[PDB]
Write a protein that binds this DNA or RNA. Structure first.
Length: 105
DNA sequence: GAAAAGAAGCTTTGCTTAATAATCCATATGGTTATAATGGGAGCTGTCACGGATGCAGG
């Protein structure tokens, strides 16, 4: 969707803004991937699904980071190896909120 | 005889997970300590009845 395009525009705007460099930005399963450079704060990528949900996924994230993203109301799915899903709705205010909580981790 | 409806048969896809890079950490191994530092310790103490093998000795 073009809303996913514009939310990609503000996403790269606020990740490029806040000094969080990217490994690669990928359209994969027709979904966006704002992948972090290193596994910083136990986080892998800042992805966008086309199903109205931008998602933050990681590997062995600390609990207090997860609490900081449930401050802005995000779902989580831990795995058996430390893989953690973080669901939020894809919107510009959620772009600003997720990248401003990620910008203070 | 039409028309909803449900399966056959394709696809994706979010999730998992097994293979593999990375790293770190137990582990071994050896070295190296330059004053001088000179014979242990529990041994049980209240069996016991037989018995055969030493063991010693004088004729």
């Amino acid at each position: 969707t073009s809303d996913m395009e514009e939310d990609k525009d503000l996403m790269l705007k606020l990740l490029d803004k806040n000094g969080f460099v990217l490994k690669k930005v990928e359209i994969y399963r027709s979904n966006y991937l704002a992948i972090l450079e290193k596994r910083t704060n136990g986080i892998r990528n800042f992805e966008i699904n086309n199903n109205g949900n931008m998602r933050i996924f990681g590997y062995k994230m600390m609990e207090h980071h997860i609490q900081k993203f449930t401050d802005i109301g995000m779902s989580c799915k831990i795995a058996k190896n430390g893989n953690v899903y973080l669901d939020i709705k894809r919107s510009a205010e959620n772009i600003e909120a997720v990248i401003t909580v990620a910008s203070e981790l």
